[PDB]
Amino acid sequence: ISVRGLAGVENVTELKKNFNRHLHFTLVKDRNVATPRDYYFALAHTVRDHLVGRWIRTQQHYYEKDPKRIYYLSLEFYMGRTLQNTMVNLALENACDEATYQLGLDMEELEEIEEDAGLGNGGLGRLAACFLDSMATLGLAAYGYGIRYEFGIFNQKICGGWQMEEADDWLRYGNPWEKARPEFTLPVHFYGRVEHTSQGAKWVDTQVVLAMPYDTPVPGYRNNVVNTMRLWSAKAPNDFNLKDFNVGGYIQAVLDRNLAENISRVLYPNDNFFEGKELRLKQEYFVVAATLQDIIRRFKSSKFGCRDPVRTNFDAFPDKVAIQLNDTHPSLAIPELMRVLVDLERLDWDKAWEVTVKTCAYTNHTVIPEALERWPVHLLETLLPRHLQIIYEINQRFLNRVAAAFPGDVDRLRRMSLVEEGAVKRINMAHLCIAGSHAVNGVARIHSEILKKTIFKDFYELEPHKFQNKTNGITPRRWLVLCNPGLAEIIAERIGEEYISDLDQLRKLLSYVDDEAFIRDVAKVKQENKLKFAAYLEREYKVHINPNSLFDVQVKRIHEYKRQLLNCLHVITLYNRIKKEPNKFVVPRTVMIGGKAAPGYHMAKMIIKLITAIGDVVNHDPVVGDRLRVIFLENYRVSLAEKVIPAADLSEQISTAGTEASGTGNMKFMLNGALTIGTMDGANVEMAEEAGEENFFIFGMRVEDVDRLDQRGYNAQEYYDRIPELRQIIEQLSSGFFSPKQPDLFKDIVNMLMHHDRFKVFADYEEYVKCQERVSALYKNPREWTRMVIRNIATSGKFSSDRTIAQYAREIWGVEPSRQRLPAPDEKIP
Amino acid sequence: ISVRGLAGVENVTELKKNFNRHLHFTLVKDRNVATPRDYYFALAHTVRDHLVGRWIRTQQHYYEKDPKRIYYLSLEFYMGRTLQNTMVNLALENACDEATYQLGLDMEELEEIEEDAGLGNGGLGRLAACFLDSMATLGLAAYGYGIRYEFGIFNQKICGGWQMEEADDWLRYGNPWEKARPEFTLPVHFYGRVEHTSQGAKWVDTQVVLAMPYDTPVPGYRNNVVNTMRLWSAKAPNDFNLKDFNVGGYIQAVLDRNLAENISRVLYPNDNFFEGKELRLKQEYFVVAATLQDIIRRFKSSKFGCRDPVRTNFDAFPDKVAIQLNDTHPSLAIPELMRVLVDLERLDWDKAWEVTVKTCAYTNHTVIPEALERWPVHLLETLLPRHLQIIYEINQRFLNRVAAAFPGDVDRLRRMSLVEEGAVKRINMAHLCIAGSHAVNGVARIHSEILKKTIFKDFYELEPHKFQNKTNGITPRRWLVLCNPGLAEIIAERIGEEYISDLDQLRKLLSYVDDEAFIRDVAKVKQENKLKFAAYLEREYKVHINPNSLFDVQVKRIHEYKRQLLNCLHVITLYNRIKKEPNKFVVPRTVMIGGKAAPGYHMAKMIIKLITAIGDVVNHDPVVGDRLRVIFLENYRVSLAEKVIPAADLSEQISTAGTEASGTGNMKFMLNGALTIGTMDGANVEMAEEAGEENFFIFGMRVEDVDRLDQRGYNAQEYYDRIPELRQIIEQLSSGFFSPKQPDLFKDIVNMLMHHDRFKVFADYEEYVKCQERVSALYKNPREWTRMVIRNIATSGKFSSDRTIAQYAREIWGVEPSRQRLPAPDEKIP
Ligand SMILES: O=c1[nH]cnc2c1ncn2[C@@H]1O[C@H](COP(=O)(O)O)[C@@H](O)[C@H]1O
Ligand SMILES: O=c1[nH]cnc2c1ncn2[C@@H]1O[C@H](COP(=O)(O)O)[C@@H](O)[C@H]1O
Ligand SMILES: *Cc1c(COP(=O)(O)O)cnc(C)c1O
Ligand SMILES: *Cc1c(COP(=O)(O)O)cnc(C)c1O
Ligand SMILES: CC(=O)N[C@@H]1O[C@H](CO)[C@@H](O)[C@H](O)[C@H]1O
Ligand SMILES: CC(=O)N[C@@H]1O[C@H](CO)[C@@H](O)[C@H](O)[C@H]1O
């Protein structure tokens, strides 16, 4: 059937009865009233059964051996569905497929019922999920720590061409993967004040919110290692949240509990944008405060909570603990670690600081100013008074370090301060993370260099040793084996299976680049994938596309820097050229653009309306025929990505050079047989470098050109004046060609494009369409297109998150990865 | 070990492995980290497994045979713990005791971990729970329908002698008994307006709240019947509760979902008191609207949703459906049934009314005015506009019936109206229920007569056939076999086991009233029970009592009508007499008073403070010694009741004649070997009548005397003037003898007692203490005390809820009870 494992005789039989056990005993249903949803859960529970045994021994193991622990703190974990992924990592896919088949059910139909775990916005959240999978696969004693939002990223609905947001109630029917652990609930404090008494400061008169943990299993790939993702939920104490007496109402007091519990209610839907709301700040401290208590408790036990030197010596803390900051969101972990060590454990400042710096590491994910966290002091002042005092003291000591290093450099001092003066004082969370971490890293080579040259230049001059790079990656399991079994099978037919956990081996595929059978196969799976997607489209969304055309897709969050607008300009151009010479042949294309716009991002929502507007015109022009279709992919999310990416021919990664830190979607397309048209931005550079620039469609300004242009000054009018095709498009938008009933509907987009384009869309237009002509030329030559594809696939190995994690492990955490199978799952009951 | 069933070889082995399965696979724990709470859940899940098989076949059965269905609507279901009760009804107690013993665990210790299902206030809520157990035991196709509050009755804490309320988070660790059924979620409407168009009225522009059901199994006693209790939970739709666009905030919109979900958040802690809050009204319509859709859906299928006359003829509705209104709380079921039939199904008014009256039955539970539901019209007007119109139309037609029956009786017309004029117009829910039901019943013979003679006199003259009586009862399973196995065993030793489901057989115990061994045994179990309670007291609450003294206990909600104050006066008297003649012998007593006071009931909370105040003085007076102890039983609830009642010697049922509808606690004490001192009120009359007034301690005013006194006019001063002992007590309270630091602390109680005692406490004082002297005299004669006890126990049979249900069944519902074992639980998988 494929290498989805063995469909053993004993195990298919075993699976079937357990499926039935659960349907009866767990779901309390009988075959006669069971619906597809019931069947999905019976299966889910049956599969979950297979990893609890391994989950328990893995955790017990780490307790016995006591290795260094890795704590990945992130406010986002974009997990997606977990049924299939679990089957794949446990080698259960074929057995389950067989068993469910014998029970008369279609496994694929059941898999579509699972709701996505959308606890993330986009790239940052998904990176965390791929990292968790890789850390498990590499046998690291790692823990993912986050917030269990009851409402993840909103579900996007397109009404009249506009995006409509609606709550994502992903828990509505329950989550069979998580295990509530109310017995490990911890208290988290807010507000209050600071008392300075005799031997130390005291955080007093605080409001308490309880943090209840929920554990979700994270299975490594076929190694019997099952790590843990612990998500915190907010709960109101039953005392003060009722007991602070003297009139108000008993009923009201109970109803007001949903005020402390609102902390973990919903994820902020912002991607690369900072919103300074108090609720956000509360979520940030909440996950930090609860997680740290968990970290220290585990440390206090270790082998120190037995003997060792005997005396809670936190000197070995950094040898046993490593906490990674996914962006600045969990940045309060630094001052909180200090608070606990100094205030509670009573360590002297300097010893406490040494420990803190040695265990913390920060990962930066963007360079755009509006995405940078700068919290107003009055907020920290009210909500976390002691932390503000600690931050000021950290700043004081740090600046003294700077002054001593650069005597008389008074401007440098204000520039490096963690405290920003002005309208309202703010705290630069990024500066805090650099100062309190022993390593700071970028997510792609150019992004890392930009940090050193630009944004954190002064910090780099002060401590050059801190700055590193760790190019992002993606997991070959979900992003190849899971979403594209067809391609994985033909690859395995030639080079085996060891590449799934050793992607570098894909290079061996280079020697089949001239193999006639392979070329035919690679081309066959892609055709099957396009056919399956073309079907899904009419199935679930309804209104035909042509599977023979080039599948041109750009799927990512809607941003001005991602330039969906630039993609739009090209589409209109294609249309206008066709309308000019109707009877001239052109390579047919289906351009699919999908992504979510943050609810408050007016421009982003305007762009979504433009895309649908273009499709209204283009898709109903008889002269165009089936040569050009414009489709907006609705509710783009992980599960949808697993469907489009394998069916894509052209991947669009066209951000303005220097704005996309790394990107990961690009990698997803490269490993799945799509060719890339893009700018020298983020990881695109390392990808082209790995496949060879001849097998990539690079165009536009490099970072240097962008800067040259900024010195000069960017004037869009120039481009408007010298390019008639471009002029024609702008006047089409301005006159209502794309919005008849509301002719001035797109005035904001035009106005912006002409007068305040921060991402110089016009500057890359000419080279972009020129380049698009080149891909169309190559598509006309199937054999050569496929051979170039083989060149990309065979060379994508470097982009596996196993590589990224292995580097974090060795160069930052100080631990050694291991591909050693944990001693089976085997029963056992001590 | 006892007759807790057989501890079979095969089944104890089977139990043990399943216990282990769950501990591993369900709880995801290993023996080395498992805590008593974990063990409790492993067991709970193991036990729950045994009734899912029976649950499924019972429900399938009713679908096949299609008998008349009984729907018990109540806003309260005081369930308590359910582990032991399930073992008892499934004959699993000894096997589980054995198995857990072999696993090295104490079952009793694990049973104490289960949280109480406190979805009720007191008697009304508990009646519903005993009814459910009886309906299952009598094989009725019955369904309990209510609200799944996430916060039940508050947990009571005594701080400085005062009651402190704190949220009852009973779901904190989960509920292993319920089964969420999100797939059967139904919509419920609120607000909106009424449109009158061409062919009918339309309820429009409403706010929608979703009702998600949760099913809990209700096992009959050893008959393999497992009925269902369906509890509704409020959920916000994800559309409008987000989709009603045009600024407000996306985040705020999601946070505001907890506004529609607040409907099922907390139970109103009022006992026999009406609070006209909008939230309450919403809860009332919510349970009614959701339940009815469920009822009609089931009816539409039946055997009509196949063939029958073919044409949705609701003429057979009353033949297939019976809905019982537990008080007026679910009274909106009447106009709602009309709305659906008329507005949606399009039946003519008269045919719809005929059906409605024929399927609805109302049970009244109190005669005090402040407990009567009278909803302001402006509220119904805003929240349920169409229902108000239907109520006015019902009133219109009803009053026309009255006018035609009593021509010219204009006062009668205003008196019987469902609409009350005055300050603000109100709707008398009780009048609504009488008019729209074919049967109205009281809960005790005297209470029923009072309804006919007083409160509903006019209604009785109009339709005498509607009024009936159904004396309350309690379930012998939980209230004898479960809480008092010792007594059940010795009874079974002589007369067998058939009495558990046929309590009348207890009469056979009359012939052992002179049996020397029996007298010794009955006396032995009571001594063991008192010893076990005396221990629990020091275990969980701490500060000694004497097991040889008479256990004088009064446990029920704190009310002015229950007269805990009268009990207080006696206690102080005992104290004062002892202080007068210290070296005179008196029968030692431990008087235990426990109960919860509604949060807003100032007087009730003042009484709790008085009780503790008396104990502070009495319990620390060296002269008193161990002859008199005053203890306030904290957090009285079902699980605590299962502990005190079996250990009681004297049961206090001293309400003012004519105020306690029936009472049920009294019955609980009678069946467990306690003697009763009380007034001729509620079921006390039928109890004394059943055991013989010679075996009961009756005192005080009868209903007639109370009325005589009211004609005359009640003057407490008279009693104060003629009774020195009484005068002495009042002056002790007035001068601060019981409240040194705050001498005027009890001025409200004294002021009330002397000037506004609605329940004439002083009027029954003399006869009360006189009577108390008689019980003390009899206690001095162990042999005769026990023989009188045997006379009560042997004669309590009539007070089993099986008897009550059998009567409801035959005289109201039109169904025949059956003690036929359902065809085993046996596997099966169609
Ligand atoms: O005190 C202990 N004795 C034995 N095993 C322990 C103990 N504490 C933790 N463990 C094991 O380690 C796992 C880890 O627990 P953690 O503290 O949540 O990381 C537990 O489920 C146990 O298997
Ligand atoms: O359409 C049907 N076919 C077969 N069995 C049914 C059907 N509808 C209800 N049942 C059975 O009756 C039980 C009652 O469902 P209810 O409608 O919630 O009372 C279900 O769990 C099934 O066993
Ligand atoms: C991988 C992924 C992302 C990241 O896309 P980029 O092109 O790097 O912005 C965002 N959303 C989803 C659902 C993804 O799977
Ligand atoms: C039976 C019961 C009641 C009813 O007591 P009465 O004496 O009838 O008022 C109230 N509370 C609990 C917990 C009960 O078990
Ligand atoms: C702040 C933020 O979300 N940054 C995003 O992080 C992901 C994962 O590193 C990058 O691939 C992406 O380019 C970048 O925009
Ligand atoms: C309104 C109300 O709660 N009434 C209560 O109902 C229970 C059960 O019928 C009676 O025993 C009790 O005397 C009465 O006070």
Side-chain angles (χ1 to χ4, degrees), chain B residues 164 285 368 408 551 671:
Chain B
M164 295 304 295
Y285 181 61
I368 39 189
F551 272 15
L671 177 76

Side-chain angles (χ1 to χ4, degrees), chain A residues 714-733:
Chain A
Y714 176 71
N715 179 270
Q717 186 80 38
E718 210 181 82
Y719 297 91
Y720 174 92
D721 280 332
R722 346 244 249 208
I723 305 141
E725 280 205 299
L726 182 48
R727 187 184 318 132
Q728 176 190 29
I729 293 171
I730 271 100
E731 304 198 313
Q732 254 162 335
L733 292 180

Side-chain angles (χ1 to χ4, degrees), chain B residues 123-124 127 271-272 327 365-366 443 472 561-562 660-664:
Chain B
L124 176 153
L127 189 75
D271 185 282
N272 270 279
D327 209 338
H365 299 265
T366 179
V443 291
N472 283 168
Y561 91 84
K562 311 259 210 210
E660 187 79 88
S662 160
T664 37

Side-chain angles (χ1 to χ4, degrees), chain B residues 56 100 292 332 551 570 578 610 640-641 670 673 676 706 823 829:
Chain B
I56 281 162
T100 57
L292 266 166
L332 285 169
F551 272 15
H570 172 245
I578 285 164
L610 210 223
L640 180 45
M670 182 187 186
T676 307
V706 178
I829 221 304

Side-chain angles (χ1 to χ4, degrees), chain B residues 47-287:
Chain B
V47 172
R48 166 201 187 255
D49 269 346
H50 292 272
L51 82 161
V52 280
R54 279 168 264 236
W55 199 9
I56 281 162
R57 16 203 327 143
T58 300
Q59 294 313 305
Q60 171 52 280
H61 184 82
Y62 299 157
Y63 172 72
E64 307 272 66
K65 306 317 254 181
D66 187 44
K68 172 171 230 218
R69 260 88 156 186
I70 326 293
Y71 294 104
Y72 200 80
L73 274 68
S74 160
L75 253 81
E76 285 177 40
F77 283 101
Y78 215 161
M79 309 295 286
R81 306 136 143 48
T82 114
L83 177 59
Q84 193 182 357
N85 185 252
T86 301
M87 291 187 181
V88 167
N89 280 13
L90 252 28
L92 246 34
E93 206 153 18
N94 261 346
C96 282
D97 206 343
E98 179 62 45
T100 57
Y101 170 81
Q102 281 180 26
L103 257 9
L105 310 156
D106 186 339
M107 187 151 92
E108 272 194 40
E109 191 188 58
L110 265 34
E111 266 156 7
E112 280 305 320
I113 282 148
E114 177 170 6
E115 199 102 358
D116 264 46
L119 313 184
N121 279 282
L124 176 153
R126 220 310 132 179
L127 189 75
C130 284
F131 273 14
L132 252 34
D133 171 277
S134 282
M135 285 179 296
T137 291
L138 292 186
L140 298 171
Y143 306 78
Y145 269 93
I147 295 197
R148 177 180 179 276
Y149 305 104
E150 46 186 274
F151 292 106
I153 188 63
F154 65 88
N155 271 305
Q156 171 189 65
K157 285 245 176 94
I158 304 307
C159 280
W162 301 95
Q163 157 174 307
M164 295 304 295
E165 300 92 37
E166 105 183 350
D168 166 45
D169 204 344
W170 74 295
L171 295 170
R172 181 174 49 258
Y173 294 82
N175 179 348
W177 308 108
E178 73 186 11
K179 180 67 225 276
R181 297 289 207 216
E183 64 266 34
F184 305 125
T185 292
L186 261 9
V188 164
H189 306 262
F190 290 100
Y191 307 101
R193 72 203 155 75
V194 175
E195 263 181 17
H196 291 283
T197 71
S198 351
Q199 235 66 205
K202 278 194 333 283
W203 193 4
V204 116
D205 304 348
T206 65
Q207 162 193 123
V208 174
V209 174
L210 306 182
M212 163 168 302
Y214 281 78
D215 294 351
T216 292
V218 182
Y221 177 73
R222 261 106 122 149
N223 58 170
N224 300 325
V225 163
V226 182
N227 281 348
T228 296
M229 170 174 75
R230 175 158 280 178
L231 263 26
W232 304 102
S233 209
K235 250 262 215 226
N238 70 312
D239 81 312
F240 261 120
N241 233 93
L242 217 307
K243 119 140 134 117
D244 213 322
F245 78 137
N246 257 115
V247 169
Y250 159 80
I251 298 289
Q252 248 308 120
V254 169
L255 299 191
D256 280 351
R257 289 171 60 91
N258 300 299
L259 236 67
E261 299 176 358
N262 270 348
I263 283 163
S264 61
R265 185 111 32 223
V266 62
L267 161 85
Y268 268 84
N270 300 324
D271 185 282
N272 270 279
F273 190 73
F274 171 60
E275 242 205 301
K277 301 312 224 243
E278 188 190 47
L279 186 53
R280 216 325 213 259
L281 183 55
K282 267 160 171 192
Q283 294 187 332
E284 277 175 8
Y285 181 61
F286 176 73
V287 68

Side-chain angles (χ1 to χ4, degrees), chain A residues 20-21 24-32 38 48-49 52-53 55-56 60 151-154 164-167 169 172-173 179 181-184 212 235-236 238-239 242-243 245 250-251 254-255 257-258 262 265-269 279 599 827-830, chain B residues 20-21 24-32 38 48-49 52-53 55-56 60 151-154 164-167 169 172-173 179 181-184 212 235-236 238-239 242-243 245 250-251 254-255 257-258 262 265-269 279 599 827-830:
Chain A
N20 285 312
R21 222 235 338 278
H24 191 71
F25 297 101
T26 306
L27 268 20
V28 195
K29 292 262 173 141
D30 59 288
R31 292 295 306 237
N32 299 275
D38 295 316
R48 166 201 187 255
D49 269 346
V52 280
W55 199 9
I56 281 162
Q60 171 52 280
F151 292 106
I153 188 63
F154 65 88
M164 295 304 295
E165 300 92 37
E166 105 183 350
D169 204 344
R172 181 174 49 258
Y173 294 82
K179 180 67 225 276
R181 297 289 207 216
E183 64 266 34
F184 305 125
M212 163 168 302
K235 250 262 215 226
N238 70 312
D239 81 312
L242 217 307
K243 119 140 134 117
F245 78 137
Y250 159 80
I251 298 289
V254 169
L255 299 191
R257 289 171 60 91
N258 300 299
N262 270 348
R265 185 111 32 223
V266 62
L267 161 85
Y268 268 84
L279 186 53
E827 210 271 306
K828 66 97 195 38
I829 221 304
Chain B
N20 285 312
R21 222 235 338 278
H24 191 71
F25 297 101
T26 306
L27 268 20
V28 195
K29 292 262 173 141
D30 59 288
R31 292 295 306 237
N32 299 275
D38 295 316
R48 166 201 187 255
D49 269 346
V52 280
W55 199 9
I56 281 162
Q60 171 52 280
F151 292 106
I153 188 63
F154 65 88
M164 295 304 295
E165 300 92 37
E166 105 183 350
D169 204 344
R172 181 174 49 258
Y173 294 82
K179 180 67 225 276
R181 297 289 207 216
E183 64 266 34
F184 305 125
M212 163 168 302
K235 250 262 215 226
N238 70 312
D239 81 312
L242 217 307
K243 119 140 134 117
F245 78 137
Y250 159 80
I251 298 289
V254 169
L255 299 191
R257 289 171 60 91
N258 300 299
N262 270 348
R265 185 111 32 223
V266 62
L267 161 85
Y268 268 84
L279 186 53
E827 210 271 306
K828 66 97 195 38
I829 221 304

